[PDB]
Amino acid sequence: ADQLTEEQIAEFKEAFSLFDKDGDGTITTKELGTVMRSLGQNPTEAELQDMINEVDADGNGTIDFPEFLTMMARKM
């Protein structure tokens, strides 16, 4: 039952907030890999591009916290 726990959600939020420079609660696709590296993951470039093409299906090159949480849950 991969249910993200409250502590796992908090650690993800602190890491997500570090790349939110304007306090808008969102991060760009180019900073996703760095957030992942700060979270303890080592993704390849092709895996990063695929994660980018899925979250930006409409084409706005930006990721909000809930979309980031859903990508995390699918990877767990």
Structural features, described:
The protein is mainly alpha-helical and 76 residues long. The protein has one domain (1-76): Recoverin, domain 1 (Orthogonal Bundle), CATH 1.10.238. It is 57% helix and 8% strand. It is built from four helices and two strands, in the order H-E-H-H-E-H. The protein has a two-stranded antiparallel sheet with strand order 1-2. The chain is globular, with a radius of gyration of 12 Å. It is classed as transport protein. The entry lists the keywords EF hands, transport protein. It forms a monomeric assembly. Refined solution structure of calmodulin N-terminal domain.
How would you characterize the largest beta sheet?
Answer: 2 strands, antiparallel
- Rg from C-alpha positions? 12 Å
What structural class is derived from the secondary structure elements?
Answer: mainly alpha
What's the CATH class label? Mainly Alpha
Architecture per CATH nomenclature, i.e. the level-2 architecture: Orthogonal Bundle
Order of helices and strands: HEHHEH
Shape: globular
CATH topology (fold) name: Recoverin, domain 1
Number of DSSP helical runs: 4
Strand order of the largest sheet: 1-2
Provide the β-strand percentage band: 5-15%
Family: Belongs to the calmodulin family.
GO cellular component, one term: myosin II complex
Binding site for Ca(2+) 2: 56, 58, 60, 62, 67
Binding site for Ca(2+) 1: 20, 22, 24, 26, 31
